[model samples]
Target: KTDTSNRLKQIMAERNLKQVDILNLSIPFQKKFGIKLSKSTLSAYVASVQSPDQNRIYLLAKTLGVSEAWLMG
Candidate 1:
């Protein structure tokens, strides 16, 4: 766990958010900021199989309503 994946999993379970929900959360941010999120990337993120760009992490923090430090905690 990048601390991120586990944290994401915990928040996701608590919020009852689905895998697609996280991708959906990124949509609006994608539209406004041009930060794209795809199923493959989502899978990578969920599994902690890959690392994300710093800005992607930044956007995810905003979309998920958690502090960046905490989400990456």
Candidate 2:
């Protein structure tokens, strides 16, 4: 599935950010890029039930202070 679930969970924990915090972090990107990350989708990602889309991954990369490719791993 090419999921980044493990790395995403790790970074979230390392930064002490909750699932809601991830949505909060996407605020700037959402406003400019019109990308919305819903909490339901986030839960799926954390649970490894689905992978994040490309734009969302990019948003996560910037907010999480990691690279896009790294997040895809």
Candidate 3:
């Protein structure tokens, strides 16, 4: 499976966002998509303990202004 922790951090770095920013940063997307993404889930992804599902992946890539392929790597 693709390990995206480093890429996740890189994108976060490019955005000047931290783990704590996930909740706030995802607010709009969550609301628009009616999806739920808690800090713990996002942390899991960043820690390489878990991966986001395809829908979440799409939302995340879109939120980060990056390609899904990039995030998948």
TM-score, one value per model = 0.87, 0.85, 0.85
Q: Write the per-residue lDDT of candidate 2 for residues 1-73, one digit (tens) a residue.
A: 3358888888888989898888787788778777787888878888898998898888778777799999988
Which one wins on lDDT?
Answer: 2
List clash counts for every candidate, in order: 0, 0, 0
Q: Which candidate is the best by TM-score?
A: 1
Q: For residues 1-73, what per-residue lDDT tens digits would candidate 3 score against the true structure?
A: 3367888888888888988886677779988887778889888989888988987787787778789988887
Rank all candidate structures by their lDDT, best first, as comma-separated numbers: 2, 3, 1
Candidate 2 yields a Cα-based lDDT of: 0.82
* Alpha-carbon local distance difference test for all models: 0.81, 0.82, 0.82
lDDT of 1 by residue, 1-73 (tens): 7777787788899999987988898789878787877889878888999766787787788778888878766
Task: Looking at model 3, report the run of 10 residues with the lowest lDDT sum.
Answer: 1-10
What is the TM-score (0 to 1) of candidate 3? 0.85
